[PDB]
Amino acid sequence: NDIAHNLAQVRDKISAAATRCGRSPEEITLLAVSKTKPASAIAEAIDAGQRQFGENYVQEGVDKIRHFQELGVTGLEWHFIGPLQSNKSRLVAEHFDWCHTIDRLRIATRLNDQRPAELPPLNVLIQINISDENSKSGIQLAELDELAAAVAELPRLRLRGLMAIPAPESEYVRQFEVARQMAVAFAGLKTRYPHIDTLSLGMSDDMEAAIAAGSTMVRIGTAIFGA
């Protein structure tokens, strides 16, 4: 396919979905999910104006980060959106700008400790397992207040909101209901904690329900880079 054309098509759908439910299209960040795609494909996306990329595997993501740092491309934002094992946390703390997958205090404390002080604080989301019994990633909502309080004190992290990967769901009604559960948790978090502004929620198949429910960031891979 053509990455530049796909990017425009995805941005159009995001913009339409926001407009339909009265939201401004600027409220929704497109996170281009480049896992398993070569740097040359990311390079095409960059040449077409895309600046935020999400990677699922640490060494793959760090190799790409270094590649575009050495080319001297600036303005990029790299999000780690895969599960994080403790033996790979240092590479994430030293190179990524965001991490969506905080689901236990020890991994956040490791990231905090391994983040150099000269870098900006690592932007982190707490991941909720909202509806997926087949996943072991993410916390239950009942554990959120406690974990958020603990994570919030880490000086080299910045708690920015929540992420979830709901169980696959074909019914729009259930897509919206599950997404609203996350939006409701997001809003409650936003009242007490400072600078809560990111709800990472939604991919191609549930994009409309996620945006209608209150997502601020959709994660799109196949529809941009192909399969």
Domain borders along the chain are: 1-227
SS3 content of the chain, % helix, strand, coil (to 5): 50, 20, 35
CA dihedral sign, ordered 109, 111, 114, 117: negative
Resolution for this experimental structure (Å) = 2.0
CA dihedral sign, ordered 180, 17, 29, 206: positive
Three-state SS at 166: coil
Which residues, including other chains, have CB under 8 Å from residue 140's CB and lie 6 or more apart? 128, 129
b/e for 84-94, b at 16 or more Cβ within 10 A? beeebbebbbe
Please give the C-alpha separations between residue 25 and each of 12, 16, 54, 68, 78, in angstroms, as whole numbers.
9, 8, 20, 28, 21
Which residues, including other chains, have CB under 8 Å from residue 5's CB and lie 6 or more apart? none
How far is residue 148 CA from its own chain's centroid? 17
